[PDB]
Amino acid sequence: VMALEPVAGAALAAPVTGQTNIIDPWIRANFVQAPNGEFTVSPRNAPGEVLLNLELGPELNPYLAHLARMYNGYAGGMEVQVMLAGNAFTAGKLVFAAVPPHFPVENLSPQQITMFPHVIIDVRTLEPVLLPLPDVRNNFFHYNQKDDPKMRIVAMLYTPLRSNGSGDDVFTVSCRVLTRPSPDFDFTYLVPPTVESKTKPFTLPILTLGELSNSRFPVSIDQMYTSPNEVISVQCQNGRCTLDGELQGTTQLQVSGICAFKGEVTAHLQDNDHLYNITITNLNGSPFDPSEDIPAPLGVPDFQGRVFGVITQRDKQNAAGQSQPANRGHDAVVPTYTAQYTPKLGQVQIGTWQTDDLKVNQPVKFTPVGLNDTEHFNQWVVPRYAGALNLNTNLAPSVAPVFPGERLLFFRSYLPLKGGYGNPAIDCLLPQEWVQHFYQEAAPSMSEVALVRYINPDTGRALFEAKLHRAGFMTVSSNTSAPVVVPANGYFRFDSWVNQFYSLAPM
Amino acid sequence: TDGAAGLVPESNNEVMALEPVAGAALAAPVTGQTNIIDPWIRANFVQAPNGEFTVSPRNAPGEVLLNLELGPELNPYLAHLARMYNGYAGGMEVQVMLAGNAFTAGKLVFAAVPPHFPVENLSPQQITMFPHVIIDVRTLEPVLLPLPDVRNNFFHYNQKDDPKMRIVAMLYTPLRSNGSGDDVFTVSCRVLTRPSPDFDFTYLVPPTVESKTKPFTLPILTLGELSNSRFPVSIDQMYTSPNEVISVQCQNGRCTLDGELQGTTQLQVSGICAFKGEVTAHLQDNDHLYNITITNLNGSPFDPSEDIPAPLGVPDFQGRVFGVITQRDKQNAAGQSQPANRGHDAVVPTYTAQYTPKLGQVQIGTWQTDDLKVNQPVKFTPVGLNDTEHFNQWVVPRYAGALNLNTNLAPSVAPVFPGERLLFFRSYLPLKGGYGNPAIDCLLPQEWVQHFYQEAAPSMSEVALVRYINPDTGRALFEAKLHRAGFMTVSSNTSAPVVVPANGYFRFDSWVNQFYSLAPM
Ligand SMILES: [Zn+2]
Ligand SMILES: [Zn+2]
């Protein structure tokens, strides 16, 4: 067994806390499977590969993770149970170590894991083994708000697997990890339920692909499309929101505010076409301070191109008709690649085909429809938000799939044109409804990667799986670039929090 | 007992369901000294600095009337003792006296909230999910509450990064009354504290060195000794806000009670409505106009990328400020190498497009006296206003002209309790010519700004309760609310000069919150 002395639990925290609470005795007996508690050992693995990397806390047991939203703190350890699935005609060994709180586990040697409290178990063992996970700390108990590191338990391949195969498929030992609370685990102080943050679990909304919408243009979603070979690292400015609910770049919450602006008209020129320089405010009606940390006012376009839309004008003063002001609305185009599109400075220029009906010094409102033509349409180039004479500052960071053999997963939506030839599309990372749900919930991220699975509703089985990152993008494990053929009435389901080393099943 | 005729409840028989929590004896093997406290302070109830609060018919049910964090600053003897120690561990004992009239009817609820729980959005039924006790406002004998110091470490330090066990009061009924007369039956309540037997200090340090333990004090200065903080004159009288003015924004004379200067405020009395620079231009209209590249008031170049709306000390209202500009030559033309000097009248219009002091330019004027050198240093000394044309003191000028926005402004301030208006300090300004009697109202005197900057004491609440004391009579005239943003409000219905003796002063009474009903003037 692991050489560990007994560590105190919540009875140490008795004279500094006020309520003496208990829980259900049936939860203290049943062994519940850990959320990331499964791994398989293969003949392809090498010694020194980490397999579990578990950690102490109430997030292992989904009964304690539901009871934790009623209390103020906790203290105590757990009991781990490891099962294997092998037979007598095999060979190979595994090791299970006990790692302290502030010790960094980063690419350890197979020799160096024997310098911990460890057990070495063969892969032939018939009975499930029991390991202790104690609560080492330097205080009396843990708070549900202030998070601090805890004791981990780490599995590692010690000796490679030797067996003889059956056919075109090789033998494989599958392992499961189940936990239950120790007799000294306890909670501390009853509060109102579901009031404190930091205990709210991360979820996804149950909305199918036909009911969601794009986050970079106000068009519905058409299909899912994996990223091409020459696209490896994108950087957009709309549809950016982390899983904790922090809006980055020029991302806002309303669907209608995407590629939309509002303000007054100041200038008029007519070299060939009508120009109409326009000063802009925010989308609520406040004067835009140009020294804000944002790159631009929220909801301006974020790609090069010629956005075709309708601009309407409603004048302030009542000219006629018994005090009802006049209206006008025409087509226009905003080009985003020129040196006139400077929304950080506060000027956006439009273009109207031979229609001189737009009165100056009366406020307007732009409503986008589609593109003018496919000329200068690059959907992965950030425009110069200040024109020349200044560089782009304080953007969202670039995102990229770092795992070998993984591509980005986009949401494709086709687009109308004014005239010409082409079938263009705008790809986004997350839908707008996911952005709104992440902003309203604001649940914390326990890890850096989350695991989701696409669900077909009539069978209830998974079609593929992807990795949802903290920065707000998804990656799949595929080797081609093609639209994903799935039923349209499907959705994603959140499964667990994983590491950066989880290998997806090939798509 | 016998004086009340059985008309009121005599005692409350209800406890909070809390466990005995350890104190400073748990912390003994890891601390240094474990100092002790005088036994008279241990056994006598003394009024807390959060002592006073009232229940009124203006209060809605569900308002937080009291929010006491645990600390040594809950006792006025321990708050003086705690300025020479390093830490503490242990609880307190709180006593609430709320013996109201026999005709009223209302109830209060007191609950115990854990350390890391949010208290900002409690409903009246969420407060019953804690260990609570319900007390009506007619009980004769005072009630006793615990405050047991729940923590997850051995003791505390004087740092501000550990939340502590709180007590929270809430109004639970509407405070009705069935007296026959239309007379004020507003209940006055008091809070009295003393330390628990399991309370101790930790480690002797130099006294009054650390922050986080300095107490808030007011200076004893009469109204005849105060000075205006928006214009370099003396304060004449106090004057309530009119019914048209509901919120103000004036970047000079602004300082929080914690000791933070906001807007373009500074400390020097002579630097209000004054600047300093170099003449760079000459404009020959009917009047003579000049352009001045202004610097800071100490003699350093003004960087426009600073986090301020303007250089500190510029005028902060629309009008035409009248003063005297003077020149002293950087070179020596004559007289044993002594420089020559010129000094003439001036006028600074601040509502036009030529008053952009954030960009660096302030344009002045002199009438029919074009005797002013170029590329020589200047200084402006304000006297008053030349005419009341375009004079509005509650509009902030554009510090970068037209086609730009004001940045890093101080926030606007307004009263929120019903029936209350603002209380100003009014001084009357001289004019050059015309008919008028203008006035500039400030939120705070300049001496209070300097005192709050020198003390830098923390605030234990949002509002402080002060009273105006007449020292020859020994009787209080009125009371007011001093807010943490740096402004005072009174409870009145008119707009008139407050007629008081000019040798009276304000006296700091207690810390209150924003639901305190002031007495009507
Ligand atoms: Zn034109
Ligand atoms: Zn001249």
Side-chain angles (χ1 to χ4, degrees), chain A residues 361-414:
Chain A
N361 282 313
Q362 303 301 320
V364 294
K365 167 67 161 45
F366 183 77
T367 299
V369 174
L371 276 174
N372 201 22
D373 47 330
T374 60
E375 181 207 310
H376 279 74
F377 175 54
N378 299 318
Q379 64 162 341
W380 296 120
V381 185
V382 179
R384 300 290 166 87
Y385 279 118
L389 300 176
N390 289 284
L391 290 177
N392 278 338
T393 66
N394 204 351
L395 298 173
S398 178
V399 292
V402 296
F403 210 80
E406 278 177 10
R407 308 195 172 196
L408 285 168
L409 187 68
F410 290 145
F411 290 93
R412 189 158 277 254
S413 158
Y414 290 115

Side-chain angles (χ1 to χ4, degrees), chain B residues 355-400:
Chain B
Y355 179 82
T356 77
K358 189 188 170 45
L359 303 187
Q361 305 295 118
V362 169
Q363 174 173 295
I364 68 162
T366 308
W367 316 274
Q368 309 296 317
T369 293
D370 64 358
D371 177 52
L372 210 73
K373 293 189 182 295
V374 175
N375 315 337
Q376 302 306 301
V378 292
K379 193 170 79 69
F380 187 74
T381 316
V383 190
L385 275 66
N386 56 324
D387 51 355
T388 59
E389 183 65 13
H390 300 124
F391 169 64
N392 319 296
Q393 53 159 343
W394 297 125
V395 287
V396 193
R398 292 292 190 176
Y399 298 106

